[PDB]
Design a protein around this ligand. Sequence first.
Ligand code: NAD
Ligand code: NAD
Lengths: 334, 332
Amino acid sequence: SYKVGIWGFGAMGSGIAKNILSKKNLKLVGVHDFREEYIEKDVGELLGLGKIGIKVYPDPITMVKQTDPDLVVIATNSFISVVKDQIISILKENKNVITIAEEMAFPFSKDPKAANEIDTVAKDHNVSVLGTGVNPGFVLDTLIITLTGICLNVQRIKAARINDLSPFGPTVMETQGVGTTPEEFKQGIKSGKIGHIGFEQSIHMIAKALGWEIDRIEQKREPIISNVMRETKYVKVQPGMVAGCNHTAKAFYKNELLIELEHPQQVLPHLENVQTGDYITIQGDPDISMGINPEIPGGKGTIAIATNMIPSVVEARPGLLTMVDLPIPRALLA
Amino acid sequence: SYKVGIWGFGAMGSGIAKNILSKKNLKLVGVHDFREEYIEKDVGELLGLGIKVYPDPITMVKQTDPDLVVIATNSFISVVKDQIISILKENKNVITIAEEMAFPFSKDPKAANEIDTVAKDHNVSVLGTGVNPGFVLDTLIITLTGICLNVQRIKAARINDLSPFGPTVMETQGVGTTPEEFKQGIKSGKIVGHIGFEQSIHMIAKALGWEIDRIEQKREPIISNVMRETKYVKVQPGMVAGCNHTAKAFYKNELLIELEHPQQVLPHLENVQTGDYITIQGDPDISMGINPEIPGGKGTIAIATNMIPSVVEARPGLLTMVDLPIPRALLA
Ligand SMILES: NC(=O)c1ccc[n+]([C@@H]2O[C@H](COP(=O)([O-])OP(=O)(O)OC[C@H]3O[C@@H](n4cnc5c(N)ncnc54)[C@H](O)[C@@H]3O)[C@@H](O)[C@H]2O)c1
Ligand SMILES: NC(=O)c1ccc[n+]([C@@H]2O[C@H](COP(=O)([O-])OP(=O)(O)OC[C@H]3O[C@@H](n4cnc5c(N)ncnc54)[C@H](O)[C@@H]3O)[C@@H](O)[C@H]2O)c1
C-alpha cells in the first residue's frame, strides 16, 4: 500500500478521500483544511460514513509529521502563484505531491522560474510532483497524445468537450455567465466573474510531447445564446439570454494552425440538439476521429485520475513530472 | 538519434523501416530477412527509395551497431523467444510485434522469466507491442479506466481490415480457405484466427488487479460473396475473407471482459463498416467509438516505431505497454 494525505477537503478533496478509502492498496492517513467548520472533525463523519478515526488537522505540516504519508493530494487552488508554496511545503518534508491545480498540469511555459523551483526542491528531497485532473490532465492532453501513438505523422489536432451545466448551483451558473443578457455577459468577462482554466497548459503538453513549437495562442470566450427556453432548479434562460460560455483556443506556429480546443459549457444542451461528449480529430497519417458520448464526467474523472495516479507518482523519478512522463493511467482496484 | 535494426522485412518490417527513415530522431542501420529474394539487396531499392539486407541477424547487429532491433517475424513465443534472446545476448534492446509477446507473464511465465532474466543480465529491455494486441484492445481501454472510480465490466469491438498484413497473417486467419476447410482448421489448430486475445485480457486484468479463471473463444469464417484481391492474397467468391473472433473472460462465472474482433480483407467491397468501440461499465460508464477504425498496418508500424526511444531509455527487463510512458507520434 501507499499512504496518502489530503490538503484541501472541498468537492474534489473530499471525493478523493472517499475514493482513497475504497482502494485496496491505498490508505487514507490524514486530511487538512483551513475551514473552521471542518477542523478537528472526523473525516468519516464529514463524508457520511460514521467515525473512521481520522481527524482533520489544523496544520498541513503537523498532519504529514504525525501520520507519515508517502504522498499528499492538494486540491486547494488553480494558480501556481498560490500553490507553489503549498507544494514546496510538502516536498521539504520528503513526501510526494499530486495536485489538481489546473496551472500545475504543464507550468514550464507559463511560469518557468516557479516550475524550476519546484523541480529543484523535489530533486533535493528525492520526491516527485504531478499536476493532473480531467481537463487539463486527461481529455484534451493525455488522451489526445496517447492517440497519436498510432500515427505515423500528425499535421493538426482539433478537439472539443461539450458538457451540461444543469446539475450545478448558482456558484457555477455565475462562473459560466448562465442566465445573463449579452451585455451582462460582456461585463462579467471584463470584471472576472465569468470560462475554463487550462487551455495553455494542455496546448503546451501536446506540443512538448509531439516535439512542436508553439509561438501564438489565441483565446476567445463567447456567450452561447439560447434560441429556446431553458429552466433548471437554479436558473431560467429566456430566448436571447445566455445559456453558457464557449471557451475556445487556437495554437499556431508560423501562421499554421496546429491545435484547436473548444469547451462550450451550457445548461441543457439537448434542448437545441447539442450532444454532450468528448471529441478528438487527429488529421495526419492516418486520420483519427474519436467520440466519447456522453462526456467523461468532470468531477468523477478528476477524483478518479488524481487517485489513480498515486502509485506511479510515488514510484517515479524525482522532480516535476507531467502526465507525459508517467505510465499509462489505470483504474486502481477497489 | 537512436540506431535501429530490423529482423523481419515483410509487410510490417518494411513499413517500419520506411517509417524509421522518416524520423528526425531515429536512424535505420541494418535489416535481416531469411528470404533469398531479399538477401544482399539494398533496403532503399526494395522500398522504392546504402543499407544491405544481411543473411544473418547476429552479423547484422555486429556490423552496424543498433541500439535496438525490431523483430516482425512470427506470432508465437515458442518461435520468437530465441530470436529475442539472440539479440539481448548482443547487449541490444528489442521491440517485437509478436502477438504473444504483448503480455506473456500469465500464458507462459517461465519463457517470460527467461527473457526478463537475460534482458537484466545484459542491461537492456524488451517490449511486445502492435495495434492489436498492443493498443486498441489493451493500452487504450486501460488508459480510459484512468478516469474511473471503479470498473465492473469491459466490452469492446474492433471491426478490422486485413488488407495491410502479409502471408503470415493471411494463413493464421484462414484467408482464402473454403468454409469447411476453415472449420476443420480451427478444430485441428492449423488456423487460429486473431492471436492476442489472451494477452490483451491479461494486460487489462493485471492493470486493474483482476483475476481471470476462464476465457471462452469462438471463431467463425466470414465468407465472401465477391472477389477480393489484395497485395498478398486473392479471395474468390464463396471462399473465406477472414475470421469473426470473439472472446469472453470470466472470474467466477461473472463476465469481466468481452472482445469482438471480426476481421476481413477489404470489408468495404461488401459495405462492411469498420471501427473501434469500447464500453466500460463502471462508475462512471464510458462509451467510445473511433470511426473508421485505426488502420491495422499503419497503426502497428506507427506504435512499434514510436515506442523505440522509451524502450531504449527504460529500466532493464521484459516490459509491457503498461510499464512505459504514454505512446506518442515521433517527429518526422
Ligand atoms: N485539474 C482539473 O481538471 C480540475 C478539476 C476540478 C477542480 N480543479 C481545481 O481544484 C480546485 C477545486 O477543488 P474543489 O472543486 O474541491 O474546490 P473547493 O473550492 O470546493 O475546495 C477547496 C477546498 O480547499 C480549501 N482550501 C483552500 N485553500 C486552502 C488552504 N490554503 N489550506 C487549506 N485548505 C484550503 C477550501 O476551504 C475548500 O474546502 C480548484 O482550484 C479547481 O480549479 C481542477
Ligand atoms: N501485434 C500486432 O498488432 C500485429 C500486427 C500485424 C502483424 N503482427 C505480427 O507480426 C508478424 C509479421 O507480420 P507481417 O504481416 O509483416 O507478415 P509477412 O508475412 O508479410 O512478413 C514476415 C516476414 O518475416 C520473414 N521471416 C519470417 N521468419 C523469419 C525468420 N525466422 N528469420 C528471418 N526472417 C523471417 C518473412 O520471410 C517475411 O519477410 C506476424 O507474425 C504478425 O501476426 C502483429
